[PDB]
Amino acid sequence: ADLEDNMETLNDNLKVIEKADNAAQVKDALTKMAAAAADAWSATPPKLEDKSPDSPEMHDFRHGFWCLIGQIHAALHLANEGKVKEAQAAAEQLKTTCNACHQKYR
Template identity: 50%
Template sequence: MRKTLKVLAALTLLGASTWAMAADLADDMDTISANYKTVLKTESTDTFKQSLQNMRAAATDAQKGTPPKLENKAPDGPEMQEFRHGLSTLIGQIDQSLALANQGKLEEARKVAQDFKQTRDTYHKKFR
């Protein structure tokens, strides 16, 4: 009886930790989305830069996660590598936009940020 309870407790914790990791990825994606909306609308350079920094942090954290569609795939398999590559592409775009914003070129930075949507659409089709 006691062993059964221990096994059930271990399975429950394992299941909960798997769910929590998926929630973290979803939270990161929500953070990226919410801040992207701000990037496209704000006229404040400081708000623009802060939102880009929030997006970058969330994208970096999301690279550690696994989308539900790839849960049964090898962690170092081609699908996961492509998933991480998509986030790396987004991070590069964010860095490019942030560099322009730091130079005071808000409109050019916003134009670069508009390309985030194409990156999102490409990788959402594959992994969402």
């Protein structure tokens, strides 16, 4: 999938978690998010197509996905323990990271 598609996936599954009333539904959504973010991690966005792999921007872009994957895994861990509310709140904290990266690079 390409970057735009990984984002759609990230976005839609954020909304699935927000409306979810059960752990499995949260778990499924976080699994999809984890896969979408790992794919995206190696992507180069349009605004950075002229930048070299070792630029500060790239670094920063790759760091933001590694940060996102960390958090998804943490919420996924809570989801697996049946802790819906806590998983949802962890998901909600994720938005901070989506937005920070969007400000710089979207």
